[PDB]
Ligand binder design. Structure first.
Ligand SMILES: COc1cc2c(NC3CCN(CCCCCN)CC3)nc(NCCCN(C)C)nc2cc1OCCCCCN
Ligand SMILES: [Zn+2]
Ligand SMILES: [Zn+2]
Ligand SMILES: [Zn+2]
Ligand SMILES: [Zn+2]
Length: 255
């Protein structure tokens, strides 16, 4: 246990850092942030009159909810987990209720905006690197964590040497660079048969150029199991020429 909480209390629950492999301290060559940040101007559309919202008089569990319609339909069940019908292979955009909605803060269409609910842990792996794992079982379709970092423009990401922490939000594209500023997600390793899938979500604003990346479990994740997600083709078309994926999956597509 090299750190009581890498989030310094910014998350709803601590994210401890342990090392049972060697004596290396907890990573400290980056700034931990719980929400996305920018290192320049960024004209995100936060005009409240531009927000589409609902006028539900219930807990937004009816087919009339405008926010559910924008999401195709509300995909969250009573527990806040994605319904079985959710398409993990090609996730729809999710629009959660916002402050312009007539509903209450505890309505059904609010999950990602409620923050971290799982017991996660940053840990030293065998390959002398770092990974993240759940310390509890996590049912399928559960929101685990958001991919947080430095929001930057495509051209800006194009002049950065270290590109191993980028995440594309594919006119005019933007990326999230978790190299200098990032949250626990910057430590999740790649996996060809991922237990985590990224979903584009909109909460306080609905500027389509700036979706927020939420990781939902693709199946039951057992306590102690390491978290992972598919980095994608761009990552491997570039890094594939430097090393082979070691996710160790019988279906590994990058080794
Ligand atoms: C590591 O894998 C990734 C690399 C990326 C990258 N790399 C470039 C390579 C060339 N240098 C050039 C360096 C020049 C240096 C000059 N001193 C700048 C960074 N650029 C961009 N977007 C910008 C592409 C240009 N646009 C015009 C299309 N996105 C990337 C997304 C990646 O997968 C992310 C997958 C998830 C991984 C999560 N950890
Ligand atoms: Zn509603
Ligand atoms: Zn609502
Ligand atoms: Zn709403
Ligand atoms: Zn692999």
């Amino acid at each position: 246990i090299v750190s009581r909480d890498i989030a310094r209390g910014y998350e709803r629950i601590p994210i401890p850092c342990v090392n049972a492999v060697d004596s290396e301290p907890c990573p400290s060559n980056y700034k931990y942030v719980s929400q996305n940040c920018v290192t320049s101007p960024m004209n995100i559309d936060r005009n409240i009159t531009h927000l589409q919202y609902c006028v539900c008089i219930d807990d937004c569990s009816s087919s009339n909810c405008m926010c559910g319609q924008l999401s195709m339909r509300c995909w969250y069940d009573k527990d806040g987990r994605l319904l079985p019908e959710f398409n993990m292979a090609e996730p729809p955009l999710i629009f959660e209720c916002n402050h312009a909605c007539s509903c209450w803060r505890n309505c059904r269409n609010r999950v990602v905006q409620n923050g971290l609910r799982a017991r996660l842990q940053l840990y030293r792996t065998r390959d002398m690197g770092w990974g993240v794992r759940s310390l509890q079982d996590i049912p399928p379709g559960t929101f685990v964590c958001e991919y947080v970092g430095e929001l930057i423009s495509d051209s800006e990401a194009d002049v950065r040497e270290e590109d191993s922490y980028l995440f594309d939000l594919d006119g005019e594209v933007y990326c999230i660079d978790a190299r200098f500023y990032g949250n626990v997600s910057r430590f999740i390793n790649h996996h060809c048969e991922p237990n985590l899938v990224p979903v584009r979500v909109f909460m306080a604003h609905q500027d389509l150029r700036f979706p927020r990346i939420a990781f939902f479990s693709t199946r039951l994740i057992e306590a102690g199991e390491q978290l992972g997600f598919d980095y994608g083709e761009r990552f491997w078309d570039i890094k594939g020429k430097l090393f082979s994926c070691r996710c160790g999956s019988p279906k590994c597509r990058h080794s």
